[PDB]
Write a protein that binds this ligand. Structure first.
Ligand SMILES: CC(=O)O[C@H]1C(=O)[C@@]2(C)[C@H]([C@H](OC(=O)c3ccccc3)[C@]3(O)C[C@H](OC(=O)[C@H](O)[C@@H](NC(=O)c4ccccc4)c4ccccc4)C(C)=C1C3(C)C)[C@]1(OC(C)=O)CO[C@@H]1C[C@@H]2O
Ligand SMILES: Nc1nc2c(ncn2[C@@H]2O[C@H](COP(=O)(O)OP(=O)(O)OP(=O)(O)O)[C@@H](O)[C@H]2O)c(=O)[nH]1
Ligand SMILES: Nc1nc2c(ncn2[C@@H]2O[C@H](COP(=O)(O)OP(=O)(O)OP(=O)(O)O)[C@@H](O)[C@H]2O)c(=O)[nH]1
Ligand SMILES: Nc1nc2c(ncn2[C@@H]2O[C@H](COP(=O)(O)OP(=O)(O)O)[C@@H](O)[C@H]2O)c(=O)[nH]1
Ligand SMILES: Nc1nc2c(ncn2[C@@H]2O[C@H](COP(=O)(O)OP(=O)(O)O)[C@@H](O)[C@H]2O)c(=O)[nH]1
Ligand SMILES: [Mg+2]
Ligand SMILES: [Mg+2]
Lengths: 118, 426, 428, 426, 428
């Protein structure tokens, strides 16, 4: 089916999720995505500096984002979504996307900022 | 939209040694990398192939891979290695000695980790990648075995780019080792799963082209590969140089591949003639398409009249009129529609480059897909069956730590592959 | 009083290389913008320089590289020179959905720039093909967005239909199934151009055995220049495009007109030539001069819109209309009694310096609706269903985000298209 | 705004022998002290380094410290000691013999009182001080031990100036004495409390830079230090020569030091290339910043990918555009932000000097702070643990009158130093 | 009828290298003081030589060494060449308290020299940054003292705000928290300049991929020259700075306006250019032309002050204001009904010999108040609180005599700053 499953897993091993530091953290993230029957995978960041906070999945029907691992909200609406990102395999980084609908090509995103627990 | 040509083995390093020899001569460039051509066509599309240094110096974006320096030494000690940087000069010691399990599994894996870093060195210098090119043989231990570990990791790295390798099918007349069909079987077992497309190259077929059609007396490896590199350069420069039918190779890979495992191509070159027939033959497009359809102009020893054409690519070079192009393309389709698959009305993709090559005013390049490629694969399979029984010199690979059911599964993939051509043959 | 031409894909920009060259031929326009006295296709600067109101779209730089390094680049601004960096790989799912979405936000913004510069926008015309990657997918992406923003504007397409015998790519029928229903959803008028019939015209009506894509669009764009710029130019009977759109399309979904033109005379043929108005309209009814590989004899004429240039006498046109009613093999419908709409330009047609048609005193463009067009669509449906039964090439759109049922649904949309002109053909 | 470079030991005198060798060559000055350059840049900022005498003679404001004349004799008998006045030639007899308690505690304290007077001789001649520079090794008896008494008294004198020393970290491969970890432990026990900042220098790492990256055959002491002195001159001349980002070293010390005890720096130099790649490589900022991030260009044997970057300084040389500077700086921060600390959004300080170095049009210099510097410190501690047990050759220092719990407290400071990195690593 | 420009720090003097260069461009002023016929920025000597009324302040002599050995030094007097000898070490406590106290008494006396030379002082403008050492701390020291002496004069700052993605020093958010509340305490008006948004303007509106701090301030100072010198220059609608100070500031604490300017046209772009009054103001509303990395769409417009040059027709401006009301996506507040103040200069704008903008017939500066500015302050606050949680870098100020509770209090002043534009955004 249509999934960015290998693309997020390729963005996993490069720069985003682990060097040697978060190597116990990534082994949970591999264990989450293999059991996940959801197709579209979404990466939540804190800022545009590519600081990982949560890994989400798109249902497609209700257009919400559910948490499998990480620190963040339980559900995320597209109103909560401020900006969306795209990972380039060749450039090995996340590139910003202009304003559009939530599509399968969206590999990563960010939120408004007020939604964090103060 | 740039290409990296990772060359491997004794063969594919020497094969690609003739290639960039053409490419620098294609664009009129000094052996040190200085441009001396007079065309903006030779000036604008340098980016796809070369990295410009300070003071008009062009770095060939191509990697020489071997576990022995000696092939790269002869490139370096010879001409046109002076354009190459020592970062392209990566080797270990010693060689695998044409051994797959030494190259792919034990010894070459350490050097590839240094090679793939240099790939990461070049790809970060690359602004926009289009795909990666490879060149080796099927019976090459350091050529294919290292390359099978290359493409498996590059596909893990870059699932999006054009993955093509240029592999040489082992000739029944040309043999140096007996475990050469072991290496070709273990290649295709991973090359199907890891590559997007490839070509089939038979030196025995290239022997006939030089001798029966070109009337050449002493074919050397470079003279054979000069025939190859002209067909190599005929494909991708059409993506680079302008044309009316600007056909991407990725456009080609959609149009040539109906099943994602059936991606094997039959190359051909249309303006093949001897030196005496230069005064005996005029240059027309129906002269070329006749020599496109010729079984004696195929670079792989397979019968195009026995099997049936899956897909056909018509790579064209020159200032041709489309009416001469389209009708003569249709005339071949009117002639040998029985040699086609039934369920496609146009089994021929036309690809016209307006920019002519040097010397000849017009040129063309045949790329075909047929079900008769399995004929060379049955040469591989049946020779594998006898050798799997007696297991002669298998202790070379057994001490490396390989399993026989892995080899049977590799045979099973070859058992799958021959059956898949019979699906679309009839 | 202005409109914008749109050139999407490798094909349409190469068409636009000829069209704006022909649009420089309209007034003797210099390559910087200098022309003595007209602002419909143009924006005029204070230094007396006129720039086109055009749209140049490609996902490949190379066609744009031919434009921005070729002639008339001092007419062209990089606001119009909109290029992509990654190819659509001849795909609908990349043109419409995957690759084309990264540029359309820049493109529609450039549209909102030029449309704000326009005063009294009449609409637009898109130049592309049916089976391409950029000119089919991204055009389906473009016409969807423009219909949202500008609903009450003219939505024209002058599109290239691939030959059933000549196709440069195999997925060209495989693309145009998904293209067509989305085109029918949004477009106000869509033409079909078959190069194969144009090949027959060049080898016979011009006797050219060596044509190129340059020389084909010389024939095509000369018609379109008489289609587009002439209807704003002053004549004896000044009708615009919008009065055709009600008159030529009496249907909710019927807007596939046949554009024909048959003064097509070689430079040597002009000496053995004396053609009246009626003699050209007889050549307009030739099956060899239809620009589409189709037979008008088996099709029922719904409409006949006549567009004229140069030496026109309307009383002789009234005899020529009676000549059409005299020579009847046309099978005209009973839904309209006698609707043969006339458009007349007093201004003479133009001749390319470097073209292959001689100087004529009159030029006749004929727009018609017939039911034999669906036979060319019947050529298309047989190509797709064999590929849909084998499921060949499906791993490039289920490689790029499409569904199997969407293909059959668009085939049923293609079937409903054949149901549309069936209801025209059956009922009278 | 002037600098005094007090050089100490067999090493740091010879290390600094290459330094002012660069500096006079940096400004085109005769070996006797006569100016022969043609730039006001080489003419205005003489004050920071040199003392102008009558008749165009420039006294190097630098002090040679040893308990043996022999190193300074070769400086004096060789070239470029002729610019040095004999007031800079201060020594005693005999040497400590690489002994800390002989150098720091008993023998060297008498000569330091003569040395600090010469400091008071020069500082009264100085109009405006900015900071005092030192250079030695960690395992140097006269180099470090005397210098630990120097900085302790200068901090008593001048608490306000920039107190930096350039100390050589002992290599696990390069050993001459066994009590070298005794010397480095007793150094950092006072170097933390007395200095403001320092660098970490490993000749074993400098072996690889000449060999793996520069392909040099025989790295001598001067050739290794010629690499060091270019990095030494790259730092402070940016304070001297004009630039867009005129960053003081005291501005640098504020930005690089979040915790006052954590002031250890990882130097790096970006334009490092062999002579063959001179014709093969273009000089760009993304070429340099790639070589800035390179672990193989680090002057200390530490893994920067293992630890996390505390603070990063980007010393730049040449006529660069800020958009090329700032975005490529951000691109590295976009690349390996996981290798940073979390609580700071910009862990990289940019420092651009507009004035280019000679020969090369652009240059760059990496100065980093990571948590993986403690890897060399665990080499110090664990070697100290075995030697504190068996107390081999400790009777040399015991007869000098030292206590073992003082060594344990010096170990405890090393126990603190590793733990303070681990508090801010994760 | 006079005022004095003030350049504090490494940045503002480098801006002043561009400013008084542009001020020589105002009348063709020679480097000695020779100009044919204006005394507002100048003091005229007996030999007909005009010297700037400028303030040059840096604790580092090197930038001053660039000035006094560079061009225009015969214009420059050592009275204005005020340098320090010891660096501020990029510090607030050294800028405001420690190092700055040794120089400020010499500085304020030079202020009392030049202000006594003035006849009809209007005020001053200070050029600096928010996160520097000299341009933040000593500016906080300077604006505190000038408010004591000259309370009823103009207290302007055109300040540089560091990018959230580009910062040359880590302590730049750590400095600007203490800078801002002291700036809010004293200043009459303060701008924010983000080099990051200027980088987008250079690469797109001028297509310059190699800009320098010189070339940035060429863009910045050309705006400020239209801001400052043009409002005293005679035009069709002569308004000074002080009438904006009442009109653009309806608040006790609201004086953070957005300065925008978008005729930004490269020399090659100008050949295909015809931009009216309305078409430039459309480009004034572009998010790519805001000079600050911010989104105007999420902010509520409080004010819109329009400053004009060159070819201006006020009846067409009246259409252009109606065009703004027509194109409304602006979310304008209900606290003012239609307050869109216009300033018109008849005089044409100036073009730098060596600059990268071509000769235009009109230039449009726009001053605006919006509520999305606090989002950039929200970018600043997250930087400081993480450093305040770790208590990093605090020893460089506690050793210089600062208090931790002062830091959170200025953060609460920064929090109350976000409360200020919240109360604008909430209530209507
Ligand atoms: C023909 C020519 O010009 O060749 C170059 C050269 O090709 C290379 C190989 C040079 C050369 O350096 C070395 O070979 C070298 C070997 C061991 C240790 C140190 C240096 C060069 O000596 C170094 C020299 O660099 C400078 O002059 C800088 O200004 C440098 N000064 C010195 O290193 C120096 C040399 C002699 C005496 C005193 C000083 C510098 C850099 C920053 C701040 C201050 C000074 C240059 C351009 C060259 C040569 C001659 C080969 C390189 O070094 C520098 C510092 O530029 C080595 O890595 C670079 C790459 C250069 O391409
Ligand atoms: N008459 C005419 N037909 C053209 C011309 N160029 C291309 N075509 C036709 O256009 C079709 C191929 O479409 P392309 O233009 O290559 O595709 P595209 O829409 O541009 O998009 P991509 O495939 O992504 O490049 C074929 O039917 C060609 O015959 C031209 O200049 N004139
Ligand atoms: N636009 C622009 N910004 C500049 C220029 N020079 C420096 N800056 C900015 O100024 C900030 C750095 O401030 P500094 O000038 O170094 O500090 P300072 O206020 O002069 O005081 P010190 O730190 O004590 O030297 C950064 O945001 C730079 O981008 C310039 O010429 N133009
Ligand atoms: N065309 C061609 N084939 C070659 C050449 N050298 C070797 N081969 C073929 O390649 C195979 C041997 O591969 P080789 O490169 O020597 O193996 P490796 O270097 O150990 O990987 C055999 O099938 C040879 O016939 C050459 O220069 N040209
Ligand atoms: N790079 C470099 N290191 C040196 C040199 N001479 C000695 N060393 C190092 O410095 C240490 C020995 O210090 P030394 O200067 O002899 O001690 P001293 O008694 O204080 O002079 C060891 O770690 C050596 O590797 C030199 O010329 N260059
Ligand atoms: Mg195309
Ligand atoms: Mg400064």
């Amino acid at each position: 089916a249509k999934s960015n499953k290998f693309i997020i897993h390729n963005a996993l091993s490069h720069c985003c999720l682990a060097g040697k530091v978060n190597e116990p953290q990534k082994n949970r993230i591999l264990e989450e995505i293999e059991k996940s029957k959801a197709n579209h995978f979404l990466i939540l960041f804190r800022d545009s500096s590519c600081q990982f906070r949560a890994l989400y999945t798109l249902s497609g029907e209700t257009e919400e984002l559910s948490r499998l691992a990480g620190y963040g909200p339980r559900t995320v609406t597209p109103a909560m979504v401020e900006g969306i990102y795209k990972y380039n395999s060749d450039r090995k980084r996340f590139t910003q996307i202009p304003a559009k609908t939530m599509s399968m090509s969206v590999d990563a995103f960010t939120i408004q900022g007020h939604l964090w627990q103060s | 939209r740039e290409i990296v040509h990772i060359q491997a083995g004794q063969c594919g390093n020497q094969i690609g040694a003739k290639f960039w020899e053409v490419i620098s001569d294609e664009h009129g460039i000094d052996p040190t990398g200085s441009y001396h051509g007079d065309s903006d066509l030779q000036l604008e599309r340098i980016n796809v192939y070369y990295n410009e240094a300070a003071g008009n110096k062009y770095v060939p974006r191509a990697i020489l891979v071997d576990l022995e320096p000696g092939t790269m030494d002869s490139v370096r000690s010879g001409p046109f290695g002076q354009i190459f940087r020592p970062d392209n000069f990566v080797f270990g010691q010693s060689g695998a000695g044409n051994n797959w399990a030494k190259g792919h599994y034990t010894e070459g894996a350490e050097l590839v980790d240094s090679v793939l870093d240099v790939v990461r060195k070049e790809s970060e210098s690359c602004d926009c990648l289009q795909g990666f090119q490879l060149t080796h043989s099927l019976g090459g231990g350091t050529g294919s075995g290292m390359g099978t570990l290359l493409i498996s990791k590059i596909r893990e790295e870059y699932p999006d780019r054009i993955m093509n390798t240029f592999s040489v099918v082992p000739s029944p007349k040309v043999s140096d080792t007996v475990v050469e069909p072991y290496n070709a079987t273990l290649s295709v077992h991973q090359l199907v799963e890891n590559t997007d497309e490839t070509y089939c190259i038979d030196n025995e077929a290239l022997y006939d082209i030089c001798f029966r059609t070109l009337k050449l007396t002493t074919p050397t490896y470079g003279d054979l590969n000069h025939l190859v590199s002209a067909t190599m350069s005929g494909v991708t420069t059409c993506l680079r140089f302008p044309g009316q039918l600007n056909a991407d190779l990725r456009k080609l890979a959609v149009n040539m591949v109906p099943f994602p495992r059936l991606h094997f191509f039959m190359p051909g070159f249309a303006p093949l003639t001897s030196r005496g027939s230069q005064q005996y033959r005029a240059l027309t497009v129906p002269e070329l398409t006749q020599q496109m359809f010729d079984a004696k102009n195929m670079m792989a020893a397979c019968d195009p009249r026995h099997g049936r054409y899956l897909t056909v690519a018509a790579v064209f070079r020159g200032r041709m009129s489309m009416k001469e192009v389209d009708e003569q393309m249709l005339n071949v389709q009117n002639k040998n529609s029985s040699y086609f698959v039934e369920w496609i009305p146009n089994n021929v993709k036309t690809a016209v480059c307006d920019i002519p090559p040097r010397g000849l005013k017009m040129s063309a390049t045949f790329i075909g897909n047929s079900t008769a490629i399995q004929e060379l694969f049955k040469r591989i399979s049946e020779q594998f069956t006898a050798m799997f029984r007696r297991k002669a010199f298998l202790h070379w690979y057994t001490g490396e730590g390989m399993d026989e059911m892995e080899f049977t599964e590799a045979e099973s993939n070859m058992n799958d592959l021959v059956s898949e051509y019979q699906q679309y043959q009839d | 009083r202005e409109c914008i031409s749109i050139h999407v894909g490798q094909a349409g920009v190469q068409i636009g290389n000829a069209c704006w060259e022909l649009y420089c031929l309209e007034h003797g326009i210099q390559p910087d913008g200098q022309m003595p006295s007209f602002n419909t296709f143009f924006s005029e600067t204070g230094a007396g320089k006129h720039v086109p109101r055009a749209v140049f779209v490609d996902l490949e730089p190379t066609v744009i590289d031919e434009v921005r390094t070729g002639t008339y680049r001092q007419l062209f601004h990089p606001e119009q020179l909109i290029t992509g960096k990654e190819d659509a790989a001849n795909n609908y799912a990349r043109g419409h959905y995957t690759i084309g979405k990264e540029i359309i936000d820049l493109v529609l913004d450039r549209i909102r720039k030029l449309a704000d510069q326009c005063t009294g926008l009449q609409g637009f015309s898109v130049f592309h093909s049916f089976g391409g990657g950029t000119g089919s997918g991204f055009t389906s992406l473009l016409m969807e967005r423009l219909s949202v923003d500008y609903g009450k504007k003219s939505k024209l397409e002058f599109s290239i239909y691939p030959a059933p015998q000549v196709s440069t790519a195999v997925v060209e029928p495989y693309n145009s199934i998904l293209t067509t229903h989305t085109t029918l959803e949004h477009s106000d008028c869509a033409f079909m151009v078959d190069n194969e019939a144009i090949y027959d015209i060049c080898r016979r009506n011009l006797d050219i055995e060596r044509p190129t894509y340059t020389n084909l669009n010389r024939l095509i764009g000369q018609i379109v220049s008489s289609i587009t710029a002439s209807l704003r130019f002053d004549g004896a009977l000044n009708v615009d495009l919008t009065e055709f759109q009600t008159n030529l399309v009496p249907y909710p979904r019927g807007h596939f007109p046949l554009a024909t033109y048959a003064p097509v005379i070689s430079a040597e043929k002009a000496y053995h030539e004396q053609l009246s108005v009626a003699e050209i309209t007889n050549a307009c009814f030739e099956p060899a001069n239809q620009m589409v590989k189709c037979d008008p004899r088996h099709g029922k004429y719904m409409a006949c819109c006549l567009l004229y240039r140069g030496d026109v006498v309307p009383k002789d046109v009234n005899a020529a209309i009676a000549t059409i009613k005299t020579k009847r093999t046309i099978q005209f419908v009973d839904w309209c009694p006698t609707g043969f709409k006339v458009g007349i330009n007093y201004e003479p047609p133009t001749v390319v310096p470097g073209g292959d048609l001689a100087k004529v005193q009159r030029a006749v463009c004929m727009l018609s609706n017939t039911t034999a067009i669906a036979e060319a669509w019947a050529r298309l449906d047989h190509k797709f269903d064999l590929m849909y039964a084998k499921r060949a090439f499906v791993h490039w759109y289920v490689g790029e985000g499409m569904e199997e049922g969407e293909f059959s649904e668009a085939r049923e949309d293609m079937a409903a298209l054949e149901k549309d002109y069936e209801e025209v053909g059956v009922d009278s």
